[PDB]
Amino acid sequence: GEKTVKLYEDTHFKGYSVELPVGDYNLSSLISRGALNDDLSSARVPSGLRLEVFQHNNFKGVRDFYTSDAAELSRDNDASSVRVSKMETTN
């Protein structure tokens, strides 16, 4: 089913989507998959998936949390680190 959250660069879930397993990734980790820390503008996350966006790095203070289909990250082109996990999984 859907045990991972997808990430889109183009609004309206356009372009290419990238999904990752439960875990935390940094700015350098974002590009590792093929996405700049400051470029993502969309992300798919159906019921059963929980993710948290972190504009700043090292978890300074300002943090964001998303648990639904988002067609626009917290800060426009500014996502240092991110978090992905499964709320209640999916069959």
Tell me which residue range forms the domain holding 89. Answer: 1-91
User: Is residue 81 within 8 Å of 59, Cβ to Cβ?
Assistant: yes
**DSSP reduced 3-state for 68:** coil
Q: What is the CATH number of the domain that holds 71?
A: 2.60.20.10
10-21 in b/e form (b: 16+ CB < 10 A) is eeebeeebbbbe
Handedness of CA 9, 13, 17, 73 (dihedral sign): positive
Contacts of residues 8-11 at CB distance under 8 Å and 24 or more positions apart, as own/partner, are: 8/40, 8/41, 8/42, 8/43, 8/44, 8/71, 9/35, 9/39, 9/40, 9/41, 9/42, 10/41, 10/42, 11/41, 11/42, 11/71, 11/72
Alpha carbons 15 and 62: distance in angstroms, whole number: 28
Length of the chain: 91
Q: What is the DSSP string of 4-42?
A: SEEEEEETTTEEEEEEE-SEEE-HHHHHHHT--TTT--E
Domain count, the chain: 1
